[PDB]
Write a protein that binds this DNA or RNA. Sequence first.
RNA 1: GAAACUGCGAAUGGCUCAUUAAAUCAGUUAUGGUUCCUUUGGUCGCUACUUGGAUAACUGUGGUAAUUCUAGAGCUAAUACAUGCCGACGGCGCUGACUCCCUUUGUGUGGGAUGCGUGCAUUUAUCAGAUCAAAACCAACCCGGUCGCGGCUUUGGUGACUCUAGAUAACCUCGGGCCGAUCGCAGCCCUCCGUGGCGGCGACGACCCAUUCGAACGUCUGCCCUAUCAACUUUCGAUGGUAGUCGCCGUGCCUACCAUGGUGACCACGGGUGACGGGGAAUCAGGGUUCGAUUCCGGAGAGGGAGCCUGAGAAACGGCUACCACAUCCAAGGAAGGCAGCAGGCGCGCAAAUUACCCACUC
RNA 2: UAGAGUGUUCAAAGCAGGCCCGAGCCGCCUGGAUACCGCAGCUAGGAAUAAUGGAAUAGGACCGCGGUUCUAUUUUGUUGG
Lengths: 206, 59, 158, 263
Amino acid sequence: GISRDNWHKRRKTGGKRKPYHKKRKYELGRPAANTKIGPRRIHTVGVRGGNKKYRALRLDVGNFSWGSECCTRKTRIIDVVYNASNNELVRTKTLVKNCIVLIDSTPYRQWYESHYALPLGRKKGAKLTPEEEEILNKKRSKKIQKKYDERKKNAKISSLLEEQFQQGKLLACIASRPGQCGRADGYVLEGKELEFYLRKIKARKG
Amino acid sequence: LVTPRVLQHKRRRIALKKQRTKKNKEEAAEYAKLLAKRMKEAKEKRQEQIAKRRRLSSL
Amino acid sequence: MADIQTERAYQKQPTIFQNKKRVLLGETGKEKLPRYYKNIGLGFKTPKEAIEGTYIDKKCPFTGNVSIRGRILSGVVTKMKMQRTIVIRRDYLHYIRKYNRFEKRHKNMSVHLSPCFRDVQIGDIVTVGECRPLSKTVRFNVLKVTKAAGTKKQFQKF
Amino acid sequence: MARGPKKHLKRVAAPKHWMLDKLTSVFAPRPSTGPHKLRECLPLIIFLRNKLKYALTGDEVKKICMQRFIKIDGKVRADITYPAGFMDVISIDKTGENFRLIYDTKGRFAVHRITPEEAKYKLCKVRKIFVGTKGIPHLVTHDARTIRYPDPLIKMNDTIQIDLETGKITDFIKFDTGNLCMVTGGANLGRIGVITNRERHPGSFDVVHVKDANGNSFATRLSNIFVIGKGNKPWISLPRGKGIRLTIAEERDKRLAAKQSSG
RNA sequence: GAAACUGCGAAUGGCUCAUUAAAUCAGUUAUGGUUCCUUUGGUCGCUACUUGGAUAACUGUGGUAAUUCUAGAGCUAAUACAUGCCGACGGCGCUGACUCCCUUUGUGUGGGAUGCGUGCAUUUAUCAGAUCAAAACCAACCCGGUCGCGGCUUUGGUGACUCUAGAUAACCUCGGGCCGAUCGCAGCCCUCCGUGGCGGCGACGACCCAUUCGAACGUCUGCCCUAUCAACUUUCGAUGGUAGUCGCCGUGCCUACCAUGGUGACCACGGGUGACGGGGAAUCAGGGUUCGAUUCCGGAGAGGGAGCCUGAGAAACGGCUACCACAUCCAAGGAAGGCAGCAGGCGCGCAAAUUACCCACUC
RNA sequence: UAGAGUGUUCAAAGCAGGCCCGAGCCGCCUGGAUACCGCAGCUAGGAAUAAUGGAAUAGGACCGCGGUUCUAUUUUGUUGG
Ligand SMILES: [Mg+2]
Ligand SMILES: [Mg+2]
Ligand SMILES: [Mg+2]
Ligand SMILES: [Mg+2]
Ligand SMILES: [Mg+2]
Ligand SMILES: [Mg+2]
Ligand SMILES: [Mg+2]
Ligand SMILES: [Mg+2]
Ligand SMILES: [Mg+2]
Ligand SMILES: [Mg+2]
Ligand SMILES: [Mg+2]
Ligand SMILES: [Mg+2]
Ligand SMILES: [Mg+2]
Ligand SMILES: [Mg+2]
Ligand SMILES: [Mg+2]
Ligand SMILES: [Mg+2]
Ligand SMILES: [Mg+2]
Ligand SMILES: [Mg+2]
Ligand SMILES: [Mg+2]
Ligand SMILES: [Mg+2]
Ligand SMILES: [Mg+2]
Ligand SMILES: [Mg+2]
Ligand SMILES: [Mg+2]
Ligand SMILES: [Mg+2]
Ligand SMILES: [Mg+2]
Ligand SMILES: [Mg+2]
Ligand SMILES: [Mg+2]
Ligand SMILES: [Mg+2]
Ligand SMILES: [Mg+2]
Ligand SMILES: [Mg+2]
Ligand SMILES: [Mg+2]
Ligand SMILES: [Mg+2]
Ligand SMILES: [Mg+2]
Ligand SMILES: [Mg+2]
Ligand SMILES: [Mg+2]
Ligand SMILES: [Mg+2]
Ligand SMILES: [Mg+2]
Ligand SMILES: [Mg+2]
Ligand SMILES: [Mg+2]
Ligand SMILES: [Mg+2]
Ligand SMILES: [Mg+2]
Ligand SMILES: [Mg+2]
Ligand SMILES: [Mg+2]
Ligand SMILES: [Mg+2]
Ligand SMILES: [Mg+2]
Ligand SMILES: [Mg+2]
């Protein structure tokens, strides 16, 4: 088949080598996964020594984490924006490791609100009134400062981050090979990586 | 068909789990006793060390 | 030094995090980045430059992810044109036993030179150790540079 | 071809210390997979017809073993090519005799009958130490045994005296300078002496010295030392001549004086 | 107890030497960069007195010239196939309606019902992973005891880990992880008369860890003749960097962008070898010369090239599929094949044995 | 291969064999050595012979001292300024 043998290619000195044997099975190749976006489609392959291996095609959801707040929530995956190796994977939306994606960012909002009793990126004060303010202000008096002052001096979500929630889409980086674990996990961009990739996206495309 | 045999087999099959739990409890307890004892000699050596520091710090 | 990202992807040391807490330092402060480094063993003192420096190399034996194990060798430098890696030479004497006489031979080796050592010159001696295959033809990382034989680097007021 | 594991063993290629002849036939027993290495083992078939003469052909060994007479460390082994090895204690109930596999000083196993109040414990050499799940410390001996919850002072290269009905180590000798040792590899095979030294070359095959009861010293590798005694006092019983490895100029004299040409 | 489903083995053994010159192979080392049927030892507790439908052998009817070709109908098993309980959770963390004293509060109190998660394994992210050499003023403060002083701190291992163990927040492979709907000998107690209960010994299967037999990739040194082979190598990857794809893991192994490198008179690169490498063989004062297809070890191949199924293990040919070259049967529609296994035959040549006997010995 | 032991009837070979009671010993003794295994890698003594090096617009050692700077985490019980 396709193969990952060393012996088919020439040595330091630039001289050829003549073939030493037929292609063995332990030099086996197999074709790319090319995970797209859509409703789940996970296949499995049998690899050397039993050992199922889950190839992923058409993924949709990812277990992304928020390092500063130690949160992590199963989140929908919205799109791919920047690929650091080849660019025609963002034109065809293939989802591989160290890609850069937009996710939905809603469960992080819910956690932040319910934990710090504060509002994140909002538009007005009309929508917050009919519901969900019954959670921000409570019956409590004991507790409502006994713990919520421990949640004060700490709710300082960075400006670069705060500007994102106003659209509801967050930049994230994959940290798992979907084509070998079936899952597409990762983390959400913080600190200086954020500035880096903001610059890079604004620079190349558009 | 459920003859007396198959019931005996199930009885033994759960009896073994019972025995394993017994063994785990016994072994954990005994080793914990012995290890705690070792800690005692450790600390007694540490204290004879800081007690000996009070001598060779002299003069 | 502060600008080190030149590739199409962000360069950071793994096993290292950037917290986002306690914003009060005043008019300046910590660069906001600690350093990861480790020891090699066998008696090799990690260069202070590796600690204080600010660079990224997944293959540098003092900061990155490689283990030194097996043979230890040494050789004199003969070329440094490829980036982050150099070419060294080893001379030895084979023994023809019909005659009772030796014959001179040499062998070239590619090794990988972290940016920790910065002041190497053709002619320097270098002691290298064995790693996992880091490229097609590279199996050895530089562990310790030296110019300890004559015709030394600098004149005789050192 | 070779595309999978082999399963025959040729008579010439077999180990030397089995002391096999040359002209019986092309094969040798090929010990089955077990706790002891293929070169260090002694299959059960070779112990019953080449040494104790109890059987005569392979089938007689098979029908001696099937009747459940032979015990290797208490358990009842029915596989005739089972790999017995150093510190294993064969017991033949129907006769009432016992044995201990120990190297004789020429570097080969020999029959060594022991008293039945001794064949209840065997020594093992510690090979690994690790902390399992939930924080339980483990042990691995030279014959693949795994002891859970060992004392927190037993370390690598030490020796431990276990029981054959429980495991559950009882005593342990610690490797350091001054204890007895028997050597189990290379040139010095089956010699005994106090350890007396240990040099340490980091990353390659630390070396060890020894010293017999006659001044003779002989280095070795640390992975070939096997402590068998606290000091000058071997715990387990010893074969005749006690690992002293006399030279050939002495072996001739004893052969001549004893005139051991008959009985 | 025939047959038949099921399991296992068929990847060892045997034969030959065409290929192949830093390749194979030898000594030396490394997996801290991986997989491992089996054996050996660990590990086995977050309708249940027992579930489902459907096949073979067998009965019966068949087709074609032909094959270890197979169709239709009628029955019936499981350690095949496929579902799915019971036990024993009394767990703890986060939640916090409350209420209880002293300070309204804040802050100092103790309980607390109500709720979510709470076995191992998989994937991502985070936290901690301690002791160091002493003093002086400020707030709360343990203790020797009182309305401002002397005295104290916590797995394992390595030369070396981004190791091992621990904590947190989540994630989960279904039809695509585990915690027994299986089988054979031998027995017992009954607020007691066959049910409730419990006691032994094995066969089998199974998650992960170790061990064993290996396998795979990698380091240093080692080769016959040739200059009538002096420069070779590269977007048809040649040497290197960054990120990925793929793979059992390391790696231009392969893709995208970037740099312009790597090898050579110490013989690169090309060519030849009646070249498979070695343990060894013949001759030999001392040094050497020539041989090694051939019983032990390593490699490679089943007419030539190529592709793959099944499996722990094969790029397997006493396995399958296709092209090339051969060759057999035919009712001209179709089917079938691989002796460099043992005998035997043709051919080739100066050149090489019987179409015998037997598992009694080694395995 | 060299080499030790052993009347295969001697030898080439082989790894065997040797003892006494008639059986009443229900046995006993003993062997299956050793040397070699170039080069390359590993380990510790020797220092003749052969390569190789130290300060010449200097820098060696004594806590000798001034200037200047980064910084380690201990103790004052701990925690924090
Ligand atoms: Mg497996
Ligand atoms: Mg074979
Ligand atoms: Mg083959
Ligand atoms: Mg066997
Ligand atoms: Mg069958
Ligand atoms: Mg099989
Ligand atoms: Mg070939
Ligand atoms: Mg050539
Ligand atoms: Mg050629
Ligand atoms: Mg080579
Ligand atoms: Mg080898
Ligand atoms: Mg090799
Ligand atoms: Mg089997
Ligand atoms: Mg098991
Ligand atoms: Mg039917
Ligand atoms: Mg690269
Ligand atoms: Mg890579
Ligand atoms: Mg060029
Ligand atoms: Mg050049
Ligand atoms: Mg060539
Ligand atoms: Mg040849
Ligand atoms: Mg040939
Ligand atoms: Mg000669
Ligand atoms: Mg040959
Ligand atoms: Mg030929
Ligand atoms: Mg032949
Ligand atoms: Mg062969
Ligand atoms: Mg090999
Ligand atoms: Mg042919
Ligand atoms: Mg199989
Ligand atoms: Mg084939
Ligand atoms: Mg075959
Ligand atoms: Mg066939
Ligand atoms: Mg065919
Ligand atoms: Mg054939
Ligand atoms: Mg033939
Ligand atoms: Mg003729
Ligand atoms: Mg002839
Ligand atoms: Mg002829
Ligand atoms: Mg047979
Ligand atoms: Mg001879
Ligand atoms: Mg002879
Ligand atoms: Mg040789
Ligand atoms: Mg040598
Ligand atoms: Mg020396
Ligand atoms: Mg100066």
